[PDB]
Write a protein that binds this ligand. Structure first.
Ligand SMILES: *[C@@H]1O[C@H](CO[C@@H]2O[C@@H](C)[C@@H](O)[C@@H](O)[C@@H]2O)[C@@H](O[C@@H]2O[C@H](CO)[C@@H](O)[C@H](O)[C@H]2NC(C)=O)[C@H](O)[C@H]1NC(C)=O
Lengths: 196, 113
């Protein structure tokens, strides 16, 4: 009986990248090949495994992480990358084993006035650890003078809205992303492709 | 940096003309192992596969990591978004860490008259 990837890929609304969602997949069968062969994705990049082998393999756990970023940020969803998404929003570990899958969602996630519901973190005192999640909204102290929870000179609200509008250049359009991590831990391996 | 650059982003033509679209894999440690093109009809969201054949000619230069589509004898019904897809599948150039594909941002084609 088949993995609920449908609940992740086809959710009506995705998370903001700073508040990225994660579904723990277990005890099921997954046709990775129909995903990989689908014309609907613009990015399908597997690290430490071949996409055409996934139907043949089993894992302890698959994590399906999901969020929205702008098209020109999709390259930052990769091991060893730098920039505001990789540093402050969603960070993959150096030894990542998984696939990064993205598609243009301009038709779903942009709005005539601007969609203010998708944000990213623009400032943080340190880089995230791999798979760390920060949903805090404290004013960021950029300078020496104290903010006291008030936006002001060198005192910034740390989240910025993408404000996606349908008329934006395709690099500024919203992309839906799903990261599949394939985890192999001391347990026996319940999450299988059909051919395993 | 690592991207498929697709030119032109937009064109207008008259029917009976032809059009070339050029894609190059820039700033990548990965080899171009295989290429694919898709068409979204103006007003549809389904991506149609485009084969090498008929009014469609598909070429690849692996060494410069470029690939093109030439459409011959353009019709009004050719109007829409064209996407190119670059596959890196050997993932055995030393610094290339991924296997799979990346696409350009597309070409919006308007065919008139
Ligand atoms: C996510 O959704 C697509 C699209 O599905 C159809 O249209 C939706 C709006 C809704 O009406 C769905 O219930 C429909 O199924 C899925 O693609 C379809 O997959 C089925 C196999 O179950 C297949 O028969 C159809 O050919 C596909 N339809 C299209 C339009 O491609 C897709 O599989 C879903 N993704 C995941 C990972 O579950």
């Amino acid at each position: 009986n088949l993995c609920p990837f449908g609940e992740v890929f086809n959710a009506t609304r995705f998370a903001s990248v700073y508040a990225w969602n994660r579904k723990r997949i277990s005890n099921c069968v997954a046709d990775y090949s129909v995903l990989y062969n689908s014309a609907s994705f613009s990015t399908f990049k597997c690290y430490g495994v071949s996409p055409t082998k996934l139907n043949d393999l089993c894992f302890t756990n698959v994590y399906a992480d999901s969020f929205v970023i702008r098209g020109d940020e999709v390259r930052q969803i990769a091991p060893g990358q730098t920039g505001k998404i990789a540093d402050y929003n969603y960070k993959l570990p150096d030894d990542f084993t998984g696939c990064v899958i993205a598609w243009n969602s301009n038709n779903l996630d942009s709005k005539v006035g601007g969609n203010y519901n998708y944000l990213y973190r623009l400032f943080r005192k340190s880089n995230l650890k791999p798979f760390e999640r920060d949903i805090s909204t404290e004013i960021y102290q950029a300078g020496s003078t104290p903010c006291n929870g008030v936006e002001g000179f060198n005192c910034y609200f740390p989240l910025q809205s993408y404000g996606f509008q349908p008329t934006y250049g395709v690099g500024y359009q919203p992309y839906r992303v799903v990261v599949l991590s394939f985890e192999l831990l001391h347990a026996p391996a319940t999450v299988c492709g059909p051919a395993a | 940096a690592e991207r498929v650059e697709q030119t032109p982003t937009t064109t207008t033509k008259e029917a009976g003309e032809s059009l070339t679209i050029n894609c190059v894999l820039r700033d990548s440690p990965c080899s171009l192992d295989s290429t694919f093109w898709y068409f979204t009809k103006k007003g549809a969201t389904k991506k149609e596969n485009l084969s090498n054949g008929g009014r469609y000619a598909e070429t690849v230069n692996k060494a410069s990591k470029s690939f093109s589509l030439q459409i011959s004898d353009l019709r009004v019904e050719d109007s829409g978004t064209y996407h190119c897809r670059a596959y890196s599948t050997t993932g055995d150039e030393r610094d290339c860490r991924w296997q799979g594909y990346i696409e350009g941002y597309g070409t919006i084609v308007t065919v008139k008259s």
